[PDB]
Design a protein around this ligand. Structure first.
Ligand SMILES: [Mg+2]
Lengths: 144, 229
């Protein structure tokens, strides 16, 4: 037998953050956001305690998709009815709803799980620079 | 746009004769002067609308939070408050009558809570057809057809969301558009609308400026009698 591995439990302390998503791309931003939310980079990562930090993403509509994807790759959403496919294009997503784009691109990178739906709510994606979350005193770091 | 609106109580239905040699059915709507109870501006509240209070009641027959709201806002107490989107050209604390909103013969639309028709079956509800009665067609012959979508795991194996089966019908809001206004009566605070208005005799009836034909008016006169003896 052996010494039991150490595992923090309800010993969580989470600090907010700010990243200005000015000219980043979608997916490269999304993996960094997903890891920051899960606390995958924490030195003491307990796989079942939501040991990860909060996150606020600013200037969502300025994010960019490489290549001609803006006219060729579609995002779908289906109601449970028939003929309910709503099919929108990257150019239309970067204009009509941009925060929903980053939100969905982040959520899919989390595991099918019971904290995933509780992790994803720690991502606040404002479309423009201004916000009402200055009260929480976030730090600020570039490209994460 | 510059949507205009007013409320009343539908009092019944009759007919009146016009020039152009035509008989015109009519609904009669009792419209007590209303009272703007709040105005929402675009910048302040992210949209625009006007909140109207009506069906004045005694202060006793009124809940305390509402009567407090009325006393603080300097109004007459009213049983009902509801609001109209995109009504702009009005201020606070003002009485509004239908004469001040609609031309003599122009186009309005009417919303009203329809007539509650009970738990009704599919064939009256969705205008379905009735299975034949001759040749002995078996006792379930008043049904919604076959609800089938696919037999066997490959095809569909369920009933489709938003099917058409029996249920509750009536007592739901509906609206008839492009119904012209015939005339008014300032003595009784009463208005005349063409056509047939949804809702039972005595319900609450909202009139708005028709979206299909916003400003369109075509005048229609009456048919004063000239036969006496
Ligand atoms: Mg038999």
């Amino acid at each position: 037998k052996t010494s039991m591995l150490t595992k923090e439990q309800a010993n969580k302390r989470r600090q907010w953050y700010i990243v200005d998503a000015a000219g980043l791309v979608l997916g490269k931003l999304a993996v960094k956001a997903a890891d920051l939310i899960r606390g995958k980079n924490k030195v003491d990562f307990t796989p079942n305690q939501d040991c990860g930090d909060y996150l606020i993403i600013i200037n969502s509509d300025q994010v960019v998709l490489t290549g001609n994807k803006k006219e060729n790759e579609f995002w779908y959403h289906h109601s449970q009815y028939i003929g309910g496919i709503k099919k929108v294009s990257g150019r239309d997503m970067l204009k009509k709803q941009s925060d929903k784009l980053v939100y969905n691109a982040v959520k899919g990178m989390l595991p099918d799980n019971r904290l995933s739906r509780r992790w994803i709510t720690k991502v606040h994606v404002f479309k423009g620079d201004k916000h009402n979350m200055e009260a929480q005193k976030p730090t600020t770091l570039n490209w994460s | 746009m510059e949507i205009r609106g007013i409320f009343g109580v539908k009092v019944g239905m009759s007919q009146v004769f016009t020039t152009n040699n035509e008989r015109l059915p009519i609904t009669v709507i009792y419209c007590e002067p209303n009272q703007v109870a709040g105005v929402k501006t675009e910048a302040k509240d992210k949209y625009s609308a006007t909140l109207l209070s009506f069906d004045t009641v005694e202060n006793k027959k009124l809940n305390k939070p509402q009567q407090g709201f009325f006393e603080k806002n300097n109004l007459k107490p009213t049983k009902h408050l509801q609001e109209i989107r995109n009504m702009t050209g009005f201020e606070m604390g003002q009485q509004i009558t239908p004469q001040n909103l609609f031309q003599v013969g122009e186009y309005v639309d009417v919303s009203a809570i329809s007539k509650g028709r009970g738990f009704t079956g599919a064939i009256k509800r969705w205008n379905f057809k009735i299975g034949p009665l001759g040749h002995g067609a078996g006792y379930p012959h008043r049904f919604q057809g076959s609800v089938q979508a696919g037999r066997g795991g490959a095809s569909a194996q369920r009933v489709f969301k938003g099917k058409k089966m029996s249920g509750h019908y009536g007592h739901e809001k509906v609206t008839v558009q492009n119904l012209r206004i015939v005339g008014f009566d300032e003595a009784n605070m009463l208005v005349l609308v063409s056509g047939a208005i949804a809702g039972p005799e005595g319900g609450v009836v909202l009139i708005r400026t028709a979206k299909k034909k916003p400003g369109v008016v075509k005048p229609i006169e009456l048919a004063v009698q000239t036969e006496k003896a």
